[PDB]
Write a protein that binds this ligand. Structure first.
Ligand SMILES: Nc1ncnc2c1ncn2[C@@H]1O[C@H](COP(=O)(O)OP(=O)(O)O)[C@@H](O)[C@H]1O
Ligand SMILES: Nc1ncnc2c1ncn2[C@@H]1O[C@H](COP(=O)(O)OP(=O)(O)O)[C@@H](O)[C@H]1O
Ligand SMILES: [Mg+2]
Ligand SMILES: [Mg+2]
Lengths: 242, 242
């Protein structure tokens, strides 16, 4: 059972508790959308799942693997989980192609060149094979983020975490990235997607989790949560985004 | 003169020649501003200077070291040349401070205490010592680019390259970045800056090089080239600014 299992997870940056007891159970192939104001721990939660962040209390089990067990191969799980940030996914001094093959070639000891056959692959997947030999400075935000996804997908992960992949793009460039994330969900990928694009949520998401104050205030199918929120706070937040 | 000595530099991508015989010599402490239409070969030129791109013909000599010659320490040239990009630079998984000290420690082999002291020092110099322990996602673009400049300077380079560092920043964020760049030129740093911020050029640059079609078409003091362009192509390009 369960691809992602989180129990009473708590995190504190110094003296401040950022996550105050989070419980989440994500099934394989589920697309969970996380929403909520800024500073409610959305990004911190994702960093814990991708092991970029350590935590205080609770347990985190990635596909049967507890992240804090003695006999755990942590780097096995690190490769297992891919992540796309709102910004800073690409190295500006490297070509799009080399960006995508940097990790597989160096971590997965893989491949030196199935190393780049994989990359040309995904580039066609996101519709930018035509940009293989370009540098990040030539790409639009929309293209750059599509490349960041192809880069995360390059490691062949079972889980894909998106941290507001489009919130830094102007209105007209959001569509192309979301479209790729949609095609990804339709392919059976387990995805935890933090976003404010409540249109993508409805369309692609299985469940939605509304976070606020380091707690998960309410959850439920997009339809039910966006149309019929049950908690006032969920209303107070939705009534200024949807 | 001699900090950057370039002779008959040619570079082609396939049968298309991007740089068609560039000759230029930059003296130590000189601030050279590069302007021109997109596709003119401005980014490629900086990439050859920073060993990010190889070239087909000609000779490039950085601070007396031929990049093509039977083994010069190519890594030492990389060490002395710093570069700032348009689509900026930050490891989203590390704090600002750590982003800055990484190279100083990994490449220059500086002890952690000496590395952080220089980083705190630079952060303060760009008005961001408060962000030291923050992650990049908490920074605005103006702040992120200032962190990327600080990280570049952390290596104590002798040459600082800028490939349109403000071309992707919202207007309200341009000024804080150009300011830092201005303080850099005033303090004596040898700089090469590709930009369309002509105000910065007139104010900081010693010489402006107008590039077009892979050739350096015209050069001159900022005032002279802007107020009285001698070449028709320079005029045609300058006709569209302001
Ligand atoms: N590296 C850090 N150091 C100290 N505090 C942090 C750090 N990262 C995040 N925080 C704080 O933790 C709280 C939640 O952050 P975050 O997970 O990014 O919220 P969200 O991603 O939903 O905007 C905020 O107070 C944020 O400033
Ligand atoms: N890998 C490539 N294949 C084909 N053409 C390229 C490649 N890289 C760059 N070019 C072309 O080289 C020329 C100069 O590019 P560039 O250095 O980015 O100019 P600028 O920085 O002034 O916009 C342009 O025609 C650009 O499209
Ligand atoms: Mg966040
Ligand atoms: Mg350019």
């Amino acid at each position: 059972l369960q691809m992602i299992d989180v129990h009473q997870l708590k995190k504190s940056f110094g003296s401040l508790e950022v996550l105050k007891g989070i419980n989440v159970h994500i099934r394989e192939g589920e697309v969970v959308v996380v929403i909520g104001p800024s500073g409610s721990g959305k990004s911190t939660f994702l960093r814990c799942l991708n092991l970029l962040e350590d935590f205080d209390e609770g347990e985190i089990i990635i596909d049967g693997i507890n992240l804090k067990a003695k006999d755990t191969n942590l780097n096995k799980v690190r490769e297992e989980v891919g992540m796309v940030f709102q910004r800073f996914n690409l190295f500006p001094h490297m070509t799009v192609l080399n960006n995508i093959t940097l990790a597989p070639m160096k971590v997965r000891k893989w491949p030196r060149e199935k190393a780049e056959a994989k990359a040309m692959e995904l580039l066609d997947k996101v519709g930018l094979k035509d940009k293989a030999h370009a540098y990040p400075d030539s790409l639009s935000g929309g293209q750059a983020q599509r490349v960041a996804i192809a880069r995360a997908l390059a490691m062949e992960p079972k889980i894909m975490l998106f941290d507001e992949p489009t919130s830094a793009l102007d209105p007209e460039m959001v569509g192309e990235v979301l479209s790729v994330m949609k095609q990804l969900a339709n392919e059976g990928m387990t995805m935890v997607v933090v976003t404010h694009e409540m249109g993508f949520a409805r369309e692609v998401g299985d469940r939605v989790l509304f976070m606020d104050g380091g707690y998960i205030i309410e959850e439920g199918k997009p339809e039910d949560l966006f149309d019929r929120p049950q908690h006032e706070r969920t209303k107070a937040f939705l009534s200024k985004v949807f």
